[PDB]
Symmetry: C2
């Protein structure tokens, strides 16, 4: 028993972390096969970030302007190209540690593990969620850029995030591995508006099921409700409206605990209007939304990876 905010083992990703330097800027890079991926603002100085013209900047850089170091091994850059917001430094040596991988673009609400690095060396690992406003609440210091987020599906590593910036508000923005930002953000040092952040309702439900599975049942109540009437209350407290797909995704957690999805909603509804009144759920005084129904099934059944 027990419930913890668990991250994926990072071994397969550690071996892909390289350090990328260009001029006086140095950040992390992802070495897969014979190509190194990294944020394009590695070609920018501190001054350039205010208003950079990436084409004109990249055009004054040749292959020998990039120093890609993997521990102590040096990679010879043989080609370079800009794909959206990322750089693709084609090197001469294919990473012998290249795992079976895949590039994916996740949806808000989804969760993944971040391996925070500095100078191409692992600092630590944590689990987090993609907020409905396309930002993430992580832990990044200067130099962390290029750090990746990933999920593990058995023997396959899915890369879904690459860190690019911290916003003046302290939250983080990044891209997928093809270089497209998540959200309305641009890679420049300017004021950027992140929309209103909402609570991931489907995740909160999955977490209540985890609580029930783990012995916390005090919030279970007699009442029930309808999807429409639940959503009306959800919207007042800035929760994401729940759909039928959410109802179906929770099916397994429903069958296992013998508590219908709509009944669980009725317990949530009441916690929003009344609060937790000094009580906790799985050691928490707040409603947790960084666990997807899949994350709960995984932790509760003991799934493993290659």
């Amino acid at each position: 028993s027990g419930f913890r905010k668990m991250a994926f083992p990072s071994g397969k990703v550690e071996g892909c972390m390289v350090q990328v330097t260009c001029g006086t800027t140095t950040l992390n890079g992802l070495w897969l096969d014979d190509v190194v991926y990294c944020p394009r603002h590695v070609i920018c100085t501190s001054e350039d970030m205010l208003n950079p013209n990436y084409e004109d900047l990249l055009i004054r850089k040749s292959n020998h302007n990039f120093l890609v170091q993997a521990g102590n091994v040096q990679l010879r850059v043989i080609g370079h190209s800009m794909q959206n917001c990322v750089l693709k430094l084609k090197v001469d040596t294919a990473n012998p540690k290249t795992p079976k991988y895949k590039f994916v673009r996740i949806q808000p609400g989804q969760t993944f593990s971040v391996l925070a690095c500095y100078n191409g060396s692992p600092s630590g690992v944590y689990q987090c969620a993609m907020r409905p406003n396309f930002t993430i609440k992580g832990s990044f210091l200067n130099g962390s850029c290029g750090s990746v987020g990933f999920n593990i599906d058995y023997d396959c590593v899915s890369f879904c995030y690459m860190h690019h910036m911290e916003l003046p508000t302290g939250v983080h923005a990044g891209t997928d591995l093809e270089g497209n930002f998540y959200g309305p953000f641009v890679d420049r040092q300017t004021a950027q508006a992140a929309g209103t952040d909402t609570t991931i309702t489907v995740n909160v439900l999955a977490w209540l099921y985890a609580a029930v599975i783990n012995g916390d049942r005090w919030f279970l109540n007699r009442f029930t409700t309808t999807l429409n009437d639940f959503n009306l209350v959800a919207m007042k407290y800035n929760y994401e409206p729940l759909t039928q797909d959410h109802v179906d995704i929770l099916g397994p957690l429903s069958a296992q605990t013998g508590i219908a999805v709509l009944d669980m909603c009725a317990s949530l509804k009441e916690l929003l209007q009344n609060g937790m009144n000094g009580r906790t759920i799985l050691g928490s005084a707040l409603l947790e939304d960084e666990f997807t129904p899949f994350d709960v099934v995984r932790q509760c059944s003991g799934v493993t990876f290659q």
Copy 2:
């Protein structure tokens, strides 16, 4: 910026996880050099756990009774011995992936990363703390036994924990790598009393400094206090009494934020007597105690490992 409950990268530990089977029991083992370490109750059936005589049980087992599988590689057991509560299966092949390691016995309040495994394969990783009552609040399902806790000091892996049991209360008990239990626990299926759990006061202070560093300063107050008068209040709310060593350990966090240790205490004192009144600190509605002063310095300065 930002603060996350961060775990150490697990790559170096993943390569030491083997599956140990004996009879119909199968749990995880730690393969270092040419020796596999695992809980001795791997030689026990379900019936035996009620009242096991480990010597008499071990005596009816020969080297060929142990099946140690590392992925697909099979290890030939050439020797076996019981050291306190762990088994030491000497095999023929030294793990080529043996990292630079060390065995240590931590103190309550200290923190470490747990790599949860099932069948010798990594499931996930999380950070946690050794409670003052020598238990840990983790996430373990049947089959998890043998999972290890560790810290990373640059290029050296310090193994400090090995999971052995879940208590009827849902908390976890284990040993160091020499086989000595943490706490008054024995490896048998009986009712065991874990003492009163207290809050790790020094860790809570380090976390308040992290909050200040990250912009949350609302709890900073004019008052001050004395160590004695603070401790008197601490003891009423089940907090560990603070000593001078704790004061010295926080020195660096004190110099960096310009807030004296005793003044920080005065802010804590007030939060205990008054509560957080609907407010949060680093996204939390409770006082967090799973971060040591060292963990905070690490996350706030960007430390890396081999």
